[PDB]
Ligand binder design. Sequence first.
Ligand code: HEM
Ligand SMILES: Clc1ccc(-c2cnc[nH]2)cc1
Ligand SMILES: Clc1ccc(-c2cnc[nH]2)cc1
Ligand SMILES: Clc1ccc(-c2cnc[nH]2)cc1
Length: 463
Amino acid sequence: HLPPGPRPLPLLGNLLQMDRGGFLNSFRRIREKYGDVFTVHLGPRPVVMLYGTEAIREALVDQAEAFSGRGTIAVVEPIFRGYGVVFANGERWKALRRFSLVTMRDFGMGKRSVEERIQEEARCLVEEFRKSQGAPLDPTFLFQCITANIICSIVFGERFDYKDHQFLRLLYLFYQSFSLISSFSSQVFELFSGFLKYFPGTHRQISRNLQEILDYIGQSVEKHRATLDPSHPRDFIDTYLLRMEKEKSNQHTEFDHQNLVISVLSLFFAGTETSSTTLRYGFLLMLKYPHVAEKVQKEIDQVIGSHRLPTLEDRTKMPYTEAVIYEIQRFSDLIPIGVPHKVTKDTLFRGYLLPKNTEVYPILSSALHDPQYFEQPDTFNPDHFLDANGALKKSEAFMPFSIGKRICLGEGIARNELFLFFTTILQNFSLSSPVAPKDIDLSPKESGFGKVPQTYQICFLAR
Ligand code: HEM
Ligand SMILES: Clc1ccc(-c2cnc[nH]2)cc1
Ligand SMILES: Clc1ccc(-c2cnc[nH]2)cc1
Ligand SMILES: Clc1ccc(-c2cnc[nH]2)cc1
């Protein structure tokens, strides 16, 4: 009944079958041979694998409700412990997500605005960037400090100075925590947590960092409830917290302490590594195609220019910018395996039958590179999102944020985040790196199922 695949080893499953090349080309091969949606047994864990725009969509969109449930990710779970909105299933999920959305958009007025807030951080990014002035520098950390700062602003209410002792001792972790989750002993744990639960090692060390972050969060929440002003709701914490008051009249409501605290935690968990990486890779790309950055730099001017602040109402009158912004995302393909779904009920897909909770990885990477929707699917080439008359050409296969009932909660936030950060830099300061444009290597340093670009250095020559 389950979709077809490679016969597993009875204990490891196919984890041996992977190593052969990349742990994703391994998948490529195990398409027909086996087709477009197959199963693989990771460890002892049966996993369906939607592969390729059409197959992904058909399931995740046209059967969206069935496929909308969140899969197991056992390593970081012992903490997230099934709360908050990445990681909830059930009504809890359909309700926290409902909250979280209403609470942006109607985050404006005020103040501030997510927009104003990103610009505020941008002013700062530029400001901090000007200081080096020709002097080359790995901007992989200020990209992590600017991405992370935004989330702070939203959840905590204010942005930290980069130099800040808490912020730093918090940014590390996050990124180390990330680093650890993406290590061999984590991957093993992910699959055999049942066994390795009981013995020490990086799965604990991971949870201890996250625990720390929580005690900060929970701490900040008191401070928030003390200072709490029902009239001026400072941020997410506040707004939740006041909504929480509202629910005092319900014997059994769903907005309890730990859905707040862990959500806050999750927001960070989502809103940092990825959106920073995409910027790193963004600038790195701009370097290898120094003219694409030029073509944008001219467009930057025509529509904005010398003085004012770059505004969201720009991208609409700037196709290339956004086109580029898309190709940066398509190409860099930063979540390649998507984040685990599982089906809510037994479910009928393409004739096969997946029992309740059968896990399913939407292999989007297969969609950002889908040969059916793009041509030189493997090269960086913005004309992937242009047409002949060089206006935007959106594509049903571009889904870096996933697709359907689950699509990335902070998609908007990031979509904007990229745009401004990208334009507000490229407004001020022209990329120039020691590394020769001829052969910049877009190879990632490593994957750990999370490519990060080979570490790099460029200068920022102003105006
Ligand atoms: C370009 C950078 C980003 C990418 C590529 C990205 C991508 C994704 C993807 C692919 C998913 C999986 C949806 C699924 O399969 O269930 C997701 C989920 C999620 N992401 Fe993002 N994301 C980005 C930035 C952010 C930011 C900035 C935030 C916070 C502001 C965020 C918050 C979330 C949340 C809360 C979920 C859980 C959705 C749910 O199941 O309710 N992400 N993201
Ligand atoms: Cl090249 C390669 C390396 C490691 C794995 C792996 C991770 N977890 C189990 N096996 C697979 C393929
Ligand atoms: Cl385990 C996990 C889940 C979701 C994300 C994410 C969503 N949006 C951006 N990053 C990252 C890591
Ligand atoms: Cl099985 C599995 C799937 C996805 C991840 C991931 C994606 N982004 C960060 N971590 C980790 C482990």
